Amino acid sequence: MPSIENFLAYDFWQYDVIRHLFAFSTAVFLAGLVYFAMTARTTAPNYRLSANISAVVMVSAALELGQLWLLWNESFQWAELQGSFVPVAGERFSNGYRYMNWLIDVPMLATQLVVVCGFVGTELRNRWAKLTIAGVLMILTGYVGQYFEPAVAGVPGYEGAEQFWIWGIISTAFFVWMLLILANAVRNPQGAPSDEVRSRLKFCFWFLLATWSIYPFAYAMPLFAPTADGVVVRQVIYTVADVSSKLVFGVILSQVALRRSAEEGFEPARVA
Amino acid sequence: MPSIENFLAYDFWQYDVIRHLFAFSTAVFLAGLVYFAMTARTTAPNYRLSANISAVVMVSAALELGQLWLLWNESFQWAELQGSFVPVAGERFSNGYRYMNWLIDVPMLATQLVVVCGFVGTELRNRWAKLTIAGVLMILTGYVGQYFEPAVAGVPGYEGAEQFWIWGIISTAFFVWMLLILANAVRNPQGAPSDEVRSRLKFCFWFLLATWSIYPFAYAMPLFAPTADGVVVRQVIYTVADVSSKLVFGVILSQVALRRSAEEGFEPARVA
Amino acid sequence: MPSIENFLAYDFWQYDVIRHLFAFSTAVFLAGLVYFAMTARTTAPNYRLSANISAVVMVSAALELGQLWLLWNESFQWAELQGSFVPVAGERFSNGYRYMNWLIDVPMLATQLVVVCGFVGTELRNRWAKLTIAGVLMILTGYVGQYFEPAVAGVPGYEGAEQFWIWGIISTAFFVWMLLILANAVRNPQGAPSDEVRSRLKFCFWFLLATWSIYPFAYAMPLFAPTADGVVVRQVIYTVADVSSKLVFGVILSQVALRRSAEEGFEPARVA
Amino acid sequence: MPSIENFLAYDFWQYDVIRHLFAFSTAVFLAGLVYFAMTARTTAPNYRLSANISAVVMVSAALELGQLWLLWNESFQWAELQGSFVPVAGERFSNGYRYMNWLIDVPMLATQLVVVCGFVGTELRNRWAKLTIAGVLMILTGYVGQYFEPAVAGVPGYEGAEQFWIWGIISTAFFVWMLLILANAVRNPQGAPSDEVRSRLKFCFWFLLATWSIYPFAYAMPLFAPTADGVVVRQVIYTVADVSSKLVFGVILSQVALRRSAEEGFEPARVA
Amino acid sequence: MPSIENFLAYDFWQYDVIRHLFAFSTAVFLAGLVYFAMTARTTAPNYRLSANISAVVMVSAALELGQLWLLWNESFQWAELQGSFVPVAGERFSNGYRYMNWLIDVPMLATQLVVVCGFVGTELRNRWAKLTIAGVLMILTGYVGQYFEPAVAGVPGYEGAEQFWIWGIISTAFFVWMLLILANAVRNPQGAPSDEVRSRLKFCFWFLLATWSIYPFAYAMPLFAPTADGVVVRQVIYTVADVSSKLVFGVILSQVALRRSAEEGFEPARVA
Ligand SMILES: CCCCCCCCCCCCO[C@@H]1O[C@H](CO)[C@@H](O[C@H]2O[C@H](CO)[C@@H](O)[C@H](O)[C@H]2O)[C@H](O)[C@H]1O
Ligand SMILES: CCCCCCCCCCCCO[C@@H]1O[C@H](CO)[C@@H](O[C@H]2O[C@H](CO)[C@@H](O)[C@H](O)[C@H]2O)[C@H](O)[C@H]1O
Ligand SMILES: CCCCCCCCCCCCO[C@@H]1O[C@H](CO)[C@@H](O[C@H]2O[C@H](CO)[C@@H](O)[C@H](O)[C@H]2O)[C@H](O)[C@H]1O
Ligand SMILES: CCCCCCCCCCCCO[C@@H]1O[C@H](CO)[C@@H](O[C@H]2O[C@H](CO)[C@@H](O)[C@H](O)[C@H]2O)[C@H](O)[C@H]1O
Ligand SMILES: CCCCCCCCCCCCO[C@@H]1O[C@H](CO)[C@@H](O[C@H]2O[C@H](CO)[C@@H](O)[C@H](O)[C@H]2O)[C@H](O)[C@H]1O
Ligand SMILES: CCCCCCCCCCCCO[C@@H]1O[C@H](CO)[C@@H](O[C@H]2O[C@H](CO)[C@@H](O)[C@H](O)[C@H]2O)[C@H](O)[C@H]1O
Ligand SMILES: CCCCCCCCCCCCO[C@@H]1O[C@H](CO)[C@@H](O[C@H]2O[C@H](CO)[C@@H](O)[C@H](O)[C@H]2O)[C@H](O)[C@H]1O
Ligand SMILES: CCCCCCCCCCCCO[C@@H]1O[C@H](CO)[C@@H](O[C@H]2O[C@H](CO)[C@@H](O)[C@H](O)[C@H]2O)[C@H](O)[C@H]1O
Ligand SMILES: CCCCCCCCCCCCO[C@@H]1O[C@H](CO)[C@@H](O[C@H]2O[C@H](CO)[C@@H](O)[C@H](O)[C@H]2O)[C@H](O)[C@H]1O
Ligand SMILES: CCCCCCCCCCCCO[C@@H]1O[C@H](CO)[C@@H](O[C@H]2O[C@H](CO)[C@@H](O)[C@H](O)[C@H]2O)[C@H](O)[C@H]1O
């Protein structure tokens, strides 16, 4: 069914904040890309896969948010008599453009944590495979569920509110599985890390867990606040979650990657 | 004739999944490009042609999928009375935008496997020429056939269903020829590879064969399911096939290229 | 509410100057990006974070000004009978696209000054955190206020002029706080700088303060000149402020970064 | 006058092939650019100008074909009652967008052959000047002529068919002059080349001559086949000519540049 | 007032040449950018600022000409009954998009000549400041004047022809001042140049002066030929001037920069 945004009108500032958020996010991820590209070689070659993944995630997210920015602009138009942005006739907005890009982001972000924990070879591949299965199944079960949000929001003539619950709860199980995989990686880092590196790996885990926990809440917003203020809050928290979970996590992880690099004698990592 | 997509209406989610898939694929290939560009020099110079080809394939595929994303958006519009995305008046969608880019992708993907098998010089050129002839003829005979899919789908007022069969079967013969060329290359690698390298080359062949086999099935979909659910399934399997055959194959091949590099003493390949 | 630009008609040259300014600015920041990207490695690794931030700021600002350029073009159309550019029906212009990108620019520009002052590690992080809090709160309180500018401009049927004052004055307090943080950094540079470096750091502070002071004036323009000549002047001073505060500041800071680099023996910085 | 394409209607596949060709070509040249950019340093510095020119030509051609792709899309629209793509009211297509970019391509492609032949300094400049004069005059006399193709095609109400002949024949004279300049360069290579290098230079000349000879035929198509099948054939042969004359020529020339590099002791050229 | 182009109708070829010119120019500057970016490190670090400026100028000019290309396309549409491209209702074309980008180009092009003359440090800064003041005042006084060209062209209902004269003559004075600054730089090169380098610096000055002299003539065209043939000639001479003054000047200057580099022992400059 169409996202709940399609069933609301917006005050100038409601619509305006959302297009600002989509545009900001695109810029953050494009800037993030320039940054990670310019800083990748400072990491020792045994950790540089993580640096490289950050650049990959930035490209994905930049395009994710650019598409949303475009479609938001296309889907609503000003109506002076109503003094509102209102849906246009032949376009419908979808928040599901973000979900499909997560098939890149989620497994990649979890993999770069496993890379900095020191797993290599089959042990890296094994974890990457488990994380990609768990991550893909979490994202595809939530994508199905978010197709039922006019129904859960009680918009008249839409049924299948229970599908929203069922698919979200299944998605939550695969989320717990991913977190257990990552928790086992950071609790068992490889390559005899320092206690400072150990602490920082544990911090990266909880940062991931906290920022990733926002997404399930954004998913449930149609159920709490199916209103234009709800829609604004939802996109606000997606913006915080996106920037945190991808760019800020990339910087924090890069800092741990550099410490490990430097503790293992990489000179570029030590002179910086 | 126009593709079978032009003769159907879509439910919100049907159209929405397809635009998500096209957008996702574009992002994957653009991210793939950043990645291959950032990782090419880690391969020894005798294998770096393969690394370079991966970047070339990513550019091609990114543009292939971007065009489809654009045309999909342009070709259908929401109709609230029908609650469907429906064709617009002056635009018609074509799946044939993908075929023409395959003239780059297919021969390039098969060439980079021959490069990692160790063929150089005329033996590389000879194989590249055979593969490019076989690949170009496979793609152009299938492009002709896919112009007859309203006819094979039984859409009234379209004739030449037999052309779809004839041209697809000819295309299948050139496909078998390409596979025989590649099978002979991976069975006879050059440069005295390890048994591990030998196995991994053989795996790359079967990965290619499996992923490339999906395309003939996507071609035949108008015959099995000329419906909007069929159209969704078709674009789903194209997405799996594209990402597998190009990006995932590029990563697997890069890993064999690095092993060979390292077994031949390239230090960047050994320190990574 | 919509920005004051939406409530005015423009003479050819009024509208034309503004689209020229938006386009110029985009070009400056894109050129700035090529430049900072091509010059970053000339800085010693202990100062290269500053070089990198400049590139990040250029990307942000390029997109900031590109969005404005687009929306300006979209929001008004020529009307030969009136001989004016006049608002279009379904689009409304917003100056608030610039505010959201400042959440990147402002803290980043203040951070790169602290980097060149020599703060590292927690002392860098501590300052970055204070600056990001102070900067985010300054920008978000001013974003709220600029949603009330038809009201402060006295456009009939818009209320809440007092909100414009309240939110602007709160924003000014966080501005003073940022300046105090930076003033303490430049007065206490680290790493035993030369007196030439000391002076140049102090100059960078006052350059920042002067150029950043323009923004509060652009904010208050609806109150002084809610007219199309006022709108032109406002965008003129934003252009001066943007180019100064971001690109010219980046060059001046790079010059101090190079002096410090060279005084610490970095050869690339000495041979240049 | 408008190009002959404007005076025809297209069957789905006629229009569809042409938009596929324009899009393919854009992708080829963008991929070509990534490739030449990633491979330029493998050439010895005395031949790297040729490598660099290839990248320049790829940018030119990518934009040449992108513009055509855009204008083709804009100029015709589907008409279900006619079952044809037909001209739109306010747009007219032009094949002359390709001509103007040739002012870059033609002299640059001929110059990079002279660079690999070994001419340097004034002897390079002298040849570059003659080639640029001969090339500019060939392209501008053919551009004038192609403005008379509805007239030569016999579209009623268009006169000046003789202008098409006159300007094409003048253009052919400057073409012969260019070929004589290049033939004198490849017959008198500099720097004591191998007999293998000598042969390969001669091959590059004939490859250039053959591929460049296609263009005069595409020019004369309005005279032979002023029909929609003629228009398809013309764009097909332009595609072959463009890819051959620019990308394939770039690869072949790069291979000669590398041989010369390696025969002169450049290690990157020898290890590859 | 709107530029004189807005008051004319065009024959197919008149409009078609201008869109070809705008598109060509964009491609030249984008190719120029790839080229200067790929060749900058061949210059000794004491001259590399000039190399870097060339890349900056290419970005500026590419965007300058792209905007014009866009607006030209948007501002006029085909009218089959008139057989002309004619103005559209809600868009008006402006040649003033080029002026604002000159605020980047002009001072940057003059600065890179002063860099290759050997001025460094404050002597460079002093000249850069004088050139930027003189250049900004020349461009802004000419921008004002070009807002009066329907008046000087005698289009009925437009007054202020004298403003066109006054502002153009003031602009010419600042032009003479810039040329005197540069003439003093090339006559007093620094760093004990060769007599060959001295001659080549003098040549670069006269090349600059000749190519820059075209712009005042393009400015005065509305006064000589306020017709569609005049508009074509004007854009033709702008194209020659742009390509000469920016790209060709960049290549000639790079050649002097390399000679100086090599005469001072930079090995990359000597091996090339
Ligand atoms: C929108 C894209 C944003 C990316 C830019 C991020 C800037 C981050 C500023 C945060 C300042 C506080 O935290 C600071 O982070 C930077 C960047 O990781 C760290 O910097 C570290 O890595 C960078 C390269 O990755 C090195 O140039 C630097 O010498 C090194 O110390 C500092 O050790 C830390 O004190
Ligand atoms: C608008 C977009 C702007 C993007 C800007 C991005 C800037 C990102 C800067 C990241 C700086 C944060 O850097 C991170 O801070 C946390 C703060 O607890 C530190 O964490 C510190 O405290 C935690 C507390 O439990 C400890 O477990 C950890 O060992 C310790 O180091 C990380 O070691 C450091 O890497
Ligand atoms: C969409 C863009 C593509 C992104 C690609 C990212 C791939 C990461 C997926 C992890 C898969 C697990 O398998 C892992 O693959 C990576 C990437 O080839 C390999 O990594 C290998 O190559 C990379 C770069 O070429 C080196 O930095 C690394 O040191 C080396 O070991 C690991 O040896 C392997 O264990
Ligand atoms: C959706 C966004 C994009 C995500 C992109 C992620 C790319 C990740 C790449 C994964 C790499 C997998 O790595 C690949 O795994 C297979 C698993 O059988 C290995 O294959 C393994 O089994 C086969 C037989 O089954 C053996 O012949 C082979 O020797 C052995 O290694 C490959 O030798 C290895 O290179
Ligand atoms: C729109 C993007 C604009 C970016 C281009 C900026 C060009 C600036 C020209 C200003 C000329 C006067 O000031 C001049 O600045 C340049 C650039 O910082 C300085 O140049 C210094 O840094 C650059 C690299 O960062 C080195 O190549 C140079 O050798 C070194 O001296 C000069 O020491 C100074 O005299
Ligand atoms: C719109 C296009 C923009 C194109 C690019 C713009 C290029 C910008 C070039 C910036 C040149 C910087 O030039 C800057 O001048 C100031 C002048 O006070 C110098 O500052 C000088 O005076 C101040 C104040 O008395 C002293 O405290 C300082 O010690 C001294 O160096 C800076 O050391 C120098 O870096
Ligand atoms: C869409 C643009 C894509 C261009 C990609 C080109 C790939 C062409 C491969 C086809 C095989 C032809 O034959 C082969 O050509 C390649 C590419 O020049 C040559 O490759 C040679 O140059 C490249 C770099 O320029 C080196 O990485 C390689 O080690 C070297 O041998 C081989 O010596 C030759 O045997
Ligand atoms: C649609 C995408 C297109 C991608 C294209 C990919 C690039 C293709 C690269 C092609 C490489 C061909 O490589 C080229 O082949 C010809 C074949 O005669 C060789 O030419 C050979 O025969 C000729 C005579 O016929 C001799 O004069 C020459 O000495 C000999 O080598 C060239 O010496 C070689 O460099
Ligand atoms: C449109 C984009 C820009 C295209 C640039 C192409 C420029 C080349 C055109 C041919 C000009 C003929 O004149 C020739 O110029 C080239 C390039 O400056 C000079 O070449 C010089 O610089 C280049 C590039 O830094 C070096 O690789 C070369 O080894 C060196 O000698 C020759 O010494 C000169 O004889
Ligand atoms: C549409 C695409 C455009 C691509 C453009 C490519 C540009 C190619 C570069 C042009 C090369 C010109 O190269 C330039 O030629 C002039 C010709 O007088 C030479 O100038 C020569 O004659 C003058 C005559 O007064 C002397 O003062 C000078 O000392 C001498 O060298 C320059 O020293 C040389 O650097």
Numbering used by the authors:
A (entry chain B), B (entry chain A), C (entry chain C), D (entry chain E), E (entry chain D): 1 to 272
Task: Copy text from the publication.
NaRs are membrane proteins that actively transport sodium outside of the cell in response to light illumination. As all other MRs, the structure of NDQ rhodopsins consists of seven transmembrane helices (A-G) encapsulating a retinal cofactor, covalently attached to the lysine residue of the helix G (K255 in KR2) via a Schiff base (RSB). We thoroughly characterize a member of this subgroup, namely the protein ErNaR from Erythrobacter sp. HL-111 and show that the additional glutamic acid results in almost complete loss of pH sensitivity for sodium-pumping activity, which is in contrast to previously studied NaRs. X-ray crystallography and single particle cryo-electron microscopy reveal that the additional glutamic acid residue mediates the connection between the other two Schiff base counterions and strongly interacts with the aspartic acid of the characteristic NDQ motif.
We obtained the structures of ErNaR at acidic (4.3) and neutral (8.0) pH values at the resolution of 2.50 and 2.63 Å, respectively. Cryo-EM experiments at pH 4.3 and 8.0 also showed the rhodopsin in the pentameric form. The overall organization of the pentamer is similar to that of KR2 and other MRs. At the same time, the concavity in the central part of the pentamer at the extracellular side is organized differently in ErNaR and KR2. In general, while in KR2 this region is polar and interacts with numerous water molecules identified using X-ray crystallography (PDB ID: 6YC319), in ErNaR it is more hydrophobic. Moreover, the cryo-EM maps reveal the presence of fragments of hydrophobic chains in this region of ErNaR. Notably, the cryo-EM data strongly suggest that the interprotomeric sodium binding site found in the KR2 pentamer is absent in ErNaR. Although the maps show the spherical density at a position similar to that of the sodium ion in KR2, the coordination is unlikely to favor sodium binding. Another feature of ErNaR is the presence of a detergent (n-Dodecyl-beta-Maltoside, DDM) molecule in the cleft between the rhodopsin protomers. For instance, while the cryo-EM data clearly show a direct interaction between the D105 residue of the characteristic NDQ motif with the E64 residue of ErNaR at both pH 4.3 and 8.0, the map regions corresponding to these residues merge together and individual positions cannot be resolved.
